[PDB]
Amino acid sequence: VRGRTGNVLKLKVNFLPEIITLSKEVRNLKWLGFRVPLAIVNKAHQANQLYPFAISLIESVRTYERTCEKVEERNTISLLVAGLKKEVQALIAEGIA
Amino acid sequence: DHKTFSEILNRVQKAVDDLNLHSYSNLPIWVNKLDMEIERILGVRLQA
């Protein structure tokens, strides 16, 4: 980070809203009658299937950020939430795996 | 005031009961830290 040279882990695979844009373009091409790269169409279908998974990952990132904000606020009582932190570390290990 | 200290301690005890209901992490350590802080406050009160 800027002023924090340590690698702040954006812990998640590459998420691009352009995938959603391509899915919308595919739906529009279905609506408007255009032949297209059906390999890309199948990839967009798989991406649409995994889009809820991407949303879950984004929500998990938001939850991690909220936990980080809470920790930054109450570092003085971060030990008070030691059990939740341990559960979160276990979940982080599972998600990394 | 002795009654004022009793009221403050009653608030502290209610908070302790709430924390026990919380089921958070590091409960005995937090209790010890709170006891030490109360000791510091009481030491100021004792100097007074």
Binding site: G6, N7, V8, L9, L11, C68, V71, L79, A82, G83, K85, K86, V88, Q89, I92, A93, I96, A97 | S25, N26, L27, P28, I29
Partner: peptide, 28 residues
């Protein structure tokens, strides 16, 4: 009475979590 001795209940630090996670990513 065997007072306390509650294993020093504390979790891995978030920076320590970041370190272990970077280690895993290197292993990944």
């Amino acid at each position: 009475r065997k007072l306390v001795h509650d294993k020093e209940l504390a979790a891995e630090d978030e920076q320590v979590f970041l370190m272990k996670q970077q280690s895993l990513l290197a292993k990944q």
